[PDB]
Amino acid sequence: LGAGSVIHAVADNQDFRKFGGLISYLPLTYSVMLIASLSLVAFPFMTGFYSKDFILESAYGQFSFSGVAVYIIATIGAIFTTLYSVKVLYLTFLSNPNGPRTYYRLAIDNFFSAQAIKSYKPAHEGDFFLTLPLVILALFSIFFGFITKDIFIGLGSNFFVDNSLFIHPIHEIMIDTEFAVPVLFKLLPFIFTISFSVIALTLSELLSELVIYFKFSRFGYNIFGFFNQRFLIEFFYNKYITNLILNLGGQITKI
Amino acid sequence: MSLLYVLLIIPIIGIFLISTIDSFYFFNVSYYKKIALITTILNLIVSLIIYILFDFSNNQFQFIQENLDLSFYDIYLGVDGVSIYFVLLTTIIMPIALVSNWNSITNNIKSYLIIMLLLETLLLAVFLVLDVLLFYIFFESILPPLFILIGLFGSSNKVRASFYIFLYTLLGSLFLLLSILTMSSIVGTTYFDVLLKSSFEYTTQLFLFFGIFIAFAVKTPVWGLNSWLLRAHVESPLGGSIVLAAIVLKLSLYGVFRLILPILPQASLNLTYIVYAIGAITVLYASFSTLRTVDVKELIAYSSVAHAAIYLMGVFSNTIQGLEGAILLGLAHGFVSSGLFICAGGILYDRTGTRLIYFFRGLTQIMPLFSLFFFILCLGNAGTPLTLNFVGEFMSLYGTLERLPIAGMLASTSIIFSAAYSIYMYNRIAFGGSVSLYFIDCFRDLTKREFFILFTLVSFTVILGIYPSFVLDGLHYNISSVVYGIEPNASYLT
Amino acid sequence: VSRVHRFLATGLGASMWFWIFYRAKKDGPVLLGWKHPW
Amino acid sequence: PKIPYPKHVWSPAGGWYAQPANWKQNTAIFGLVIFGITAMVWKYSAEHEVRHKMPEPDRFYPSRYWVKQIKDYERAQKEKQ
Amino acid sequence: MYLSIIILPLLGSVVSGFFGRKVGVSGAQLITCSSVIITTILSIIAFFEVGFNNIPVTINIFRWIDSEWFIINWGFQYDSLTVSMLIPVLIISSLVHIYSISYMSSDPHNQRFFSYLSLFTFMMIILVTANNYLLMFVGWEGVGVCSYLLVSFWFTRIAANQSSISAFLT
Amino acid sequence: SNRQAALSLYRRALKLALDWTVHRNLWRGQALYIRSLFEKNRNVTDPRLQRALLKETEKLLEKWKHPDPYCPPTAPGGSKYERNLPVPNLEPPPPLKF
Amino acid sequence: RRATREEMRDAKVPLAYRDSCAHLLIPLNRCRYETYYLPWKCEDERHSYEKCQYLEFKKRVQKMEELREAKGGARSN
Amino acid sequence: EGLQKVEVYERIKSLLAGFDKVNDPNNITETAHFANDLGLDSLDTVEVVMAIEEEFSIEIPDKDADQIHSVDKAIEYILRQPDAH
Amino acid sequence: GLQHYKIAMDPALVRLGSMISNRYKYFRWTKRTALVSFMYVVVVPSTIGYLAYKTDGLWDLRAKRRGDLISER
Amino acid sequence: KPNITGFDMREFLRHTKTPTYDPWERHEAWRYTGRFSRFNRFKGALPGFGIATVAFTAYCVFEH
Amino acid sequence: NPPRIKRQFRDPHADWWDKQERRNFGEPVHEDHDILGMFSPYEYTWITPGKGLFQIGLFIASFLGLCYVVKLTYPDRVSYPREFEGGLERELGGAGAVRAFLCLDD
Amino acid sequence: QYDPPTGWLWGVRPGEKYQNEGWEGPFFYGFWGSLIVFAIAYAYKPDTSIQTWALEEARRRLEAEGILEDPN
Ligand SMILES: *P(=O)(O)OCC(C)(C)[C@H](O)C(=O)NCCC(=O)NCCSC(=O)CCCCCCCCCCCCC
Ligand SMILES: CCCCCCCCCCCCO[C@@H]1O[C@H](CO)[C@@H](O[C@H]2O[C@H](CO)[C@@H](O)[C@H](O)[C@H]2O)[C@H](O)[C@H]1O
């Protein structure tokens, strides 16, 4: 809904490369969207902190190899999550303007003489039916984790005692996750989020040359296009699986 | 006289009236059409009267007339809970078949109406007769009027198409004749009550199976053998295509509950793996080539092959669930295939005069009502819940799996590939761009005739998909006498 | 820009950073491990 | 700018930009027919909902005001001493 | 009440879809939005009622599939897990409808859009309130149909057609 | 030929650079370098080498092709392309019975 | 005191928590029931439940270390 | 409703005003010419039209790139396209 | 029969359909066509039939509990 | 060996910096100046932080 | 028969009689016309299929490599399995059911 | 601003009306009317399903055991 507002505010354009500035033009959207990114990254005491980071610590809480592996694996998932969430908030709001000039022309400075009545379109904020959800959804994204964290997590809570969520006593980890995990791994995602966020802002704004060396290195040209192309999964399915079925159907029909 | 003979005589009376009104008048063809349609309404009225008086848990044939005047070939008419719904489908379908093709015939209108009124008699008979030689007589009397229904009112490739169905259906039916003749010679009659008592030796049943299955594989039809259907179900007129797919295709579905399940059980059991292999292949090869079909009416015909395989695998499961799901999917295909021939061969071919899917695109923009019904019909063909087609597939597939788990898993691929052909055709014609540029002028949306036969057919599919017990209550007791087996603590009681 | 839109955005900012320190001030010691919750 | 469209096309959902003048009257009528169907469905639930546990006499539970199984329990429980 | 939660999103969709001519763009928007709004309060109430009192609710309406050993009811069961699922489903549906009164304001076809939105909400309710696995599968398929109808809402874009086939068959 | 064809490669070389450098200021300096390369070979005349410049540069645009070049939202291949395409025929249909 | 298995089932305490120190879960959950699970109204029942469960964990930690040294610090999970 | 003529001209005039390669910003008229009236190089004009493409959020097909050699022609292109922002 | 609306019948697409409808008149027995005609008609269905033969009544899930075996043979 | 084209990556990457002289310098001057200067750029990256921080300090001193 | 080339590779800016599908009116068509059109499976031209199997192979190897190092150095369990009195055998389905830990080996 | 509602339902232009072809007469009164009369009568048809019978006995067998409660 927040990113829905920014797409509408400009031209129904969707590309990050042509969005910039737009923090002043869209004051509510940036805050609410940053309300969301702080909980999406599970910044402490957000609605995501009480759910997302409990899985990480309950993963290490189950003292097995597979539990430790997925902790390490999901931890890397956390750090790349914080990374593209900086990419969204920096490019669209905190960046140098990248799109056309009509996105930006106000009425303060006078750029027109005989057409000053129209032809501004300075990326206006939406109306009541657009903003009332965003503000309500943001009020959830702040308080909802803390208010229901006992209904669902608790310590011996009996909300799901009708066998709706039956956990077998040979698997439970809540006590260990409450006590066994050390403070370092209990807190580690916060350090990584607070570390790579300032690093990402610095690379995206302060030192805006390193990334292009990476993109225009051949090693980085390939690593970039491997991920942008979604692990090449679509390419392989469409060519090896989907188009195999169409040619099988053709072979049966013709031959 | 019996009330089951009234179903037969009414279309016969209607043929007489069409041929003797012009003698009481250069009479209009409109009055030819009204007589034939009224006289198919009456059969439907009577058939629902028969259904109110039916007894859902009686193991004796019902509505029988005591003949006690024996001859060599005597008509015996009984109704049973395994045959009642086939009769009802016939009598509901034949009025829509007439209304669907109301303005499209344009010539030889008397002959057209007289063939369909003749067809309704013969197809009603095949479900009502209590002999297996009587069954064969009517199962093959439908062949001459269908050769003429295609060559007089068929499309461009009508001549080859009419030869294909007649000759394939004649050949396949003559292997069933040899096996029926053997059963009669051994037992002395083909009256059902005396056959079901009799148990044939295993080797004889292994050779009666080879003969009843050659016929029904020719008449399902399975993949290797379906070249007549891809011609006949396409070149035929719209009304011909509705009867051929909804009713004629089911003559062998109902003919397995009479000819195989009760009198050749050991053969059916020991040879099921051969049936399932054939059925699995026609679920795949037919699904693969229904993707690459450029004729819209041919795409609908090919869909019937993949559907028929699922019900054929259900009738060979030895389970109460796959047997009822086979009847439900036979009924389900009846309403849904009817609607998609109405969309393909009766609306696009009325407006464009072509069946090539290359000329169609974005028909939602100018025919929103056609798009709505075309999508609902397309989702039932894809076996989507809330339609009677989904129930028939769920129960058919379950029994296929419980009997031989590997073929049911390859039969269940249908779930994926039926959805892929159905959505791809719908997306290409209704969606898929804008109104096509080969349409020089605009096309009107549905007429009140086209709306109400699609609406009628679609309504049957949904309400029966919500409350299938409308049809399941009659089936349970009668179906419970074609299952072969025993359980150790429930059998041989003292 | 609109006054109502600006006021709502700043206030929602005040929703954070006051829930943050209030929770950090009250439950911060427990999370870090300085003091057990009893 | 509103899209150009053909004016001969009839669609049950309006088609393009379709709002009748009398829409408030049509909308109001549809509201009652909805509200009547929902009322029948509510009286159905009240008489067919099945609970194996019974609500406490003092805690908020507005179903106690319309569901027969519960209301019959508390009426029976309102008979003692 | 519990069986009214199920029915309101369904009823509003019928008015907006097959009766959009009669109510118009605004008439559809109010009925679709308000009907889903009403369902949301009913489910906030059901959360306190079922979860906070540990009183599961059963209802059975009629048979769906009645073969020997196989009896699947058109039946619903409200339990602790059910009411948890409804609250995000119904609020996010309620707010997205209100959001869409302005997002789709210029689109030619609003009665069709808001109908699909109500239809989608009905199917998630069916999915999380069924007694059995098979009626669960009605919503499971239902939301699948509703997704295809909404990724392809602008059916004149070939890209949209490709992505809806991909949503459907995957 | 070799005149309109060349200017295509120039405008292309500008966009590929824009796609890989998001920040406009840096690409501007990155852009003028491309102009210099097209200015170093202003006066090549023989067709034997004329096509070789085009043929070899045609390799670097794929040797550095962006996985997803930017598309304006309303162009061929954009995000809003063909969104609400009008009917290409708004005249009432000719009266025919069916 | 210790709460018996029969007593534990009548208050519908969750299965995996029917351990030695769940006599305090009965008043915790009961406190939670009377307060609508609000996380600032049963602050001392919760703490008492957590503190008691804390002790039987560090007791397990202690004698596990004895088990670890009995095997020469080898892998045991 | 859509784009006008006075609006399109006065944006594109301000576009060339910031470009150094023009001889003098005074002679910017509707019938101006990049090749001779303003005196732009052959290589200069394509970089010029690339600015027009970005300003109006459209795509200039390579076939029509050779058809843009003057302001008037450039204006005639924008107004004939209902696509521009 | 009924006169249809005007269609820009494409000379190209008409002959493409006329190609498909008449396609079978030109099928020949080559080494390539026999290979496909042998794999689809014989190998794949024979392979399916063999699995259907060897797994018949091999497994039953009906009422089976822990301590009992799915295999019936 | 260099290609028949004079392009090279090393010189391409070295030029990736703000040019000293630009024929389009005035045309693009707007994106980096005024409302779009770095201070105004991140002036409101944390909307409520200033108001909350002083408000919270009022809460802290209230207890003591 | 024309070359089997998809119309996804045609120009999106020519004077096509049918701009949406990029076709001219009487143009010859490949017999595979159904699945060469604009509404047909997409052709991805980022890299050759051979090179992709390499790169997806590299990602797999690194994923295994990250998994391997964790196995070498991952902690032992610190909490003994919680003892239940009687195994709760009556609260989990009798003896014919899986029961919790009760005075067994570790 | 919303446009007026429009359309030719059944292709009937706003001047004239739908001309009855012939089918309408029996299809609406006979075909559908037969189904409404069938539906109305189907309600009073006695239930001869095997289940209604098998349930009544199977209840009585379970009633002998403690599995089902007997009113008597
Ligand atoms: P005006 O008429 O005054 O002159 C215009 C020109 C000179 C273009 C004429 O049209 C003309 O006569 N053309 C002659 C073309 C020629 O022989 N040389 C011109 C340059 S061709 C070429 O390839 C030059 C080198 C370009 C290198 C940069 C582009 C590719 C860079 C790599 C990819 C992008 C970065 C990663
Ligand atoms: C076993 C045999 C095969 C079984 C199938 C039997 C099919 C029987 C078809 C119906 C009988 C013949 O049908 C007959 O067709 C001829 C066609 O010239 C009609 O004859 C009439 O046709 C048109 C009708 O407008 C008149 O203009 C023409 O003057 C007149 O010849 C008869 O009125 C009709 O009764």
Ligand SMILES: CCCCCCCCCCCCO[C@@H]1O[C@H](CO)[C@@H](O[C@H]2O[C@H](CO)[C@@H](O)[C@H](O)[C@H]2O)[C@H](O)[C@H]1O
């Ligand atoms: C949805 C349809 C489902 C039904 C169809 C599929 C059913 C599959 C059932 C597989 C299990 C059947 O029963 C199973 O037989 C296999 C036979 O190898 C045994 O499997 C075992 O065999 C050997 C011993 O012979 C073991 O050393 C080996 O570890 C394991 O493969 C299982 O111990 C037994 O439990």
